[PDB]
């Protein structure tokens, strides 16, 4: 420090940067028909498998519980998106899609049931079209297993062996309806998801809270609004190229497909038997030796199912904690701006928005980003008049025109010292810069 002053780089210009965050809230509801997987339709295998008693009932019961937890979690996520959402019945998203120079039309699908399943936003369409095995993807894939096509879809081989993914209780179209409602709730009165005020004013007050004077924000409202809509466009254009959030969404589908393929491959393991085919055993051996070979297949396949079910329990615990985090981000980053620094993504978090994604939610975090900086000598406090101490609120004291002035900590704009930007102390601390002539 020179005198009582320190050198600090204070921003002189800024932009808004958008950052994506995919949070997995759901997973494919895998169901296994244990006796159809273990034995298919060979009566000699079903006779032996019946002697294992409750083993298949346990496998079925654990997966039914895991799937019930996924269903309960999806309802709790949907409830969180819709909580407190109040909208005007006059809202018609074909006309009503930009406000205060901020354009929302890519984030808002058609509102109300009269449009059918088309409530998916342009941004959600742009994300769901890059993932073949969405909920509707699995339904369409299974619809083709009896279509008579020459294509040997691996999902048809899996489902005929009793491995089938059931659709979630709420369609991804309904969840995009709920993210659409939660999004328009922020941009129009009563602003039920934007603290009850116009979205541009919420953006402005959030940037001001970072220590940016209101004067530069309310004169640069066009620049802030265009920086916000450019940040959103940069997020959308970012999906046309290698992207960590898109890769995370695809990794959910790829890891499920890998686990289901690995489980189907266990039907071809011999487990030390003469063949993995029950037809080959039953066409080579008599009942007493065939039983010895079939029992090896039953033990291997039941062990494979037990290993798969144990892994599935472990993986859905991560999905439950991921959904809990997504709900916390909806409540503390989207519907409100909780005073937690790196919770809603990195940097100077302004505000966050949410959109539906295959098996999760895409959060868009908007952050205040310094473009350029001025090195300046700052005082963290002043000692004034009758040795009264003053500390700057969210800012710094600055010598400008050889006079003591205040600047916000996130934007260099010298303004006069006043009770609006000061914390008073009845005695000043040691090392506070002596300024007897102030106020």
């Amino acid at each position: 420090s020179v005198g009582g002053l320190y050198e600090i780089k204070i921003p002189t210009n800024f932009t808004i940067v958008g950052q994506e965050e995919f949070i997995q809230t759901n997973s494919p509801k895998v169901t296994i028909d244990c006796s159809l997987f273990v034995c298919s339709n060979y009566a000699a295998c079903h006779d032996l498998l019946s002697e294992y008693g409750t083993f298949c009932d346990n496998i079925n019961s654990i997966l039914d519980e895991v799937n019930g937890l996924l269903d309960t979690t999806q309802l709790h996520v949907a409830d969180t998106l819709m909580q407190g959402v109040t909208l005007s019945s006059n809202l018609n998203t074909n006309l009503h899609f930009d406000v205060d120079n901020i354009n929302f039309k890519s984030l808002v699908g058609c509102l109300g049931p009269h449009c059918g399943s088309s409530s998916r936003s342009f941004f959600e369409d742009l994300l769901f079209d890059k993932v073949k095995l969405s909920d509707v993807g699995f339904v369409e894939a299974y619809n083709n297993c009896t279509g008579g096509s020459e294509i040997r879809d691996l999902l048809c081989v899996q489902s005929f062996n009793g491995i089938k993914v059931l659709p979630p209780i709420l369609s991804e179209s309904q969840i995009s309806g709920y993210t659409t409602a939660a999004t328009v709730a922020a941009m129009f009165p009563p602003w039920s998801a934007a603290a009850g005020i116009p979205f541009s004013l919420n953006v402005q007050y959030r940037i001001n809270g970072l220590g940016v004077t209101m004067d530069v924000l309310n004169k640069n409202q066009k620049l802030i609004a265009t920086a916000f809509n450019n940040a959103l466009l940069s997020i959308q254009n970012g999906f046309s190229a290698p992207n960590s959030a898109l890769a995370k969404i695809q990794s959910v589908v790829n890891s499920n497909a890998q686990a289901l393929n690995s489980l189907l491959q266990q039907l071809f393991n011999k487990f030390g038997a003469i063949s993995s085919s029950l037809q080959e055993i039953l066409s080579r051996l008599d009942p007493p030796e065939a039983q010895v070979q079939i029992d090896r297949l039953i033990n291997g396949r039941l062990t494979a199912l037990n290993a798969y079910v144990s892994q599935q329990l472990s993986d859905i615990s991560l999905v439950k904690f991921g959904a809990a985090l997504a709900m916390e981000k909806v409540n503390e980053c989207v519907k409100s701006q909780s005073p937690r620094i790196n919770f809603c993504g990195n940097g100077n978090h302004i505000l966050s928005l949410v959109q539906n994604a295959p098996y999760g939610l895409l959060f868009m975090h908007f952050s205040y980003k310094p473009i350029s900086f001025k090195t300046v000598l700052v005082s963290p406090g002043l000692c004034i008049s009758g040795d009264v101490g003053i500390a700057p609120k969210q800012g710094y004291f600055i010598k400008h025109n050889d006079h003591w002035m205040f600047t916000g900590s996130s934007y260099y704009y010298p303004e006069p010292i006043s009770d609006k930007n000061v914390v008073f102390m009845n005695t000043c601390s040691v090392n506070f810069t002596k300024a007897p002539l102030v106020y």
């Binding site: 298919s40 019945s89 040997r152 081989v157 089938k164 209780i169």
Partner: protein
């Protein structure tokens, strides 16, 4: 097919399953596909004398012509062929004990196949501008 040379008559997958063959007598070629296998999803309400059945991902023509004919009424739902439930997807319920998937519910008074809409927006008639 054109892939069978003079010494070849069997087509195998990477797992060693027979998936096609050239008939030695007629030289005609056939692909072999697994016979259909699957599960019926039965929705049951304690107050009912019967079940609503969903043949997931199957059209009703397939169920009736290739699985089993039946006297029960039926229709092709988005989820597959539904038996013994009335198609009422234009109706909706906010609570559902028989959740079928993709926003569909089976509701019992007959059974009704209906949309599951657990959450709605609180609407107000106030001006938007």
């Amino acid at each position: 097919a054109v892939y069978y040379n003079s010494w070849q008559n069997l087509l195998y997958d990477s797992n060693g399953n027979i998936i096609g063959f050239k008939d030695f007598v007629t030289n005609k070629t056939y692909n072999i596909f697994p016979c259909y296998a699957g599960r019926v999803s039965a929705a049951f309400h304690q107050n009912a004398s019967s079940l609503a059945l969903l043949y997931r991902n199957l059209k009703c023509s397939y169920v009736l012509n290739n699985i089993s004919l039946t006297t029960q009424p039926y229709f092709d739902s988005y989820l597959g062929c539904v038996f013994n439930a009335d198609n009422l997807t234009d109706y909706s319920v906010s609570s559902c004990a028989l959740r079928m998937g993709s926003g569909f519910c089976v509701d019992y008074n007959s059974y009704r196949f209906v949309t599951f809409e657990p959450f709605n927006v609180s609407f107000v008639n106030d001006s938007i501008e």
